[PDB]
Amino acid sequence: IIGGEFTTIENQPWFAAIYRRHRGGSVTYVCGGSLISPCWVISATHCFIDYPKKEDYIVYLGRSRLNSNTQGEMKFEVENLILHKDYSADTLAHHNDIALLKIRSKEGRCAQPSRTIQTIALPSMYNDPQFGTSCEITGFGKEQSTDYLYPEQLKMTVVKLISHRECQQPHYYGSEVTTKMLCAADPQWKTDSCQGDSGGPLVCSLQGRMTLTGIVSWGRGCALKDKPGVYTRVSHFLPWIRSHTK
Numbered sequence: 001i002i003g004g005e006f007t008t009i010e011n012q013p014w015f016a017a018i019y020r021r022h023r024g025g026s027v028t029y030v031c032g033g034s035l036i037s038p039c040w041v042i043s044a045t046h047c048f049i050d051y052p053k054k055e056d057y058i059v060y061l062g063r064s065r066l067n068s069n070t071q072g073e074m075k076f077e078v079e080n081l082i083l084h085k086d087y088s089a090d091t092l093a094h095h096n097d098i099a100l101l102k103i104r105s106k107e108g109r110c111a112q113p114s115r116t117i118q119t120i121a122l123p124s125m126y127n128d129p130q131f132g133t134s135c136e137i138t139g140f141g142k143e144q145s146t147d148y149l150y151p152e153q154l155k156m157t158v159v160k161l162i163s164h165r166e167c168q169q170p171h172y173y174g175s176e177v178t179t180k181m182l183c184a185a186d187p188q189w190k191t192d193s194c195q196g197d198s199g200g201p202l203v204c205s206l207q208g209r210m211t212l213t214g215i216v217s218w219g220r221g222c223a224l225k226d227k228p229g230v231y232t233r234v235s236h237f238l239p240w241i242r243s244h245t246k
């Protein structure tokens with residue numbers, strides 16, 4: 001997250017921290033995710049497509065820092081790694097950038113909701129917020145594009161939704177951004193999601209209820225003029241989520 005502010009997991013209790021164990025035992029942060037039900041974390045396929053071994057991953061819930069065991073946190077293994085069959089990546093655009101992680105503790109249990117571990121509601125069909133709506137993003141992603149390390153403390157920011165017509169403008173992304181994708185950015189281009197924030201939530205308050213409107217997918221650089229963050233439009237994939245979580 002470029003700009004924004006430092007936060008803690010109590011303010012984003014659906015946020016999942018996904019790590020990968022490497023050969024030799026080193027563990028590195030991969031992507032963010034969202035708890036949509038006690039057994040299921042939703043993220044982006046591009047986070048896992050090159051290493052699609054469910055055994056390689058570690059999932060934390062209720063974790064506020066990259067290298068601290070936050071009080072009340074829960075650690076999980078991935079029981080099932082479901083990647084969207086029609087995923088593909090162009091130079092910029094990521095297609096069907098959605099994944100499901102069925103989580104299981106070493107005892108074989110799913111998440112136990114607490115004050116710091118909660119689910120995020122899914123959106124309803126054909127009911128996304130209008131352009132200009134302020135939405136929040138959360139992640140352990142880069143604070144600056146030139147950084148090579150990720151911030152130790154969880155960050156959050158607020159961005160505004162951009163219409164598909166505006167995002168398809170030539171100086172924006174042209175025909176590369178599709179109707180299955182949602183753009184969001186800062187009108188002043190100072191705050192944004194960045195590398196490392198992928199898979200993380202774009203949460204919008206709609207009709208008084210907070211919902212998982214988007215999943216951090218792609219963008220040209222970070223917080224660059226006319227280059228919004230691009231998110232998987234979760235409302236399009238509701239038949240796919242429902243069928244793959246049964």
Ligand SMILES: N=C(N)c1ccc2cccc(N)c2c1
Pocket residue numbers: 192193194195196197198216217218219220221222223227228229230
């Ligand atoms: N500009 C963005 N919001 C954005 C979002 C996700 C990204 C993922 C990998 C690399 C980037 N530069 C990204 C930028």
Ligand code: NA
Pocket residue numbers: 027028029066067
């Ligand atoms: Na690390």
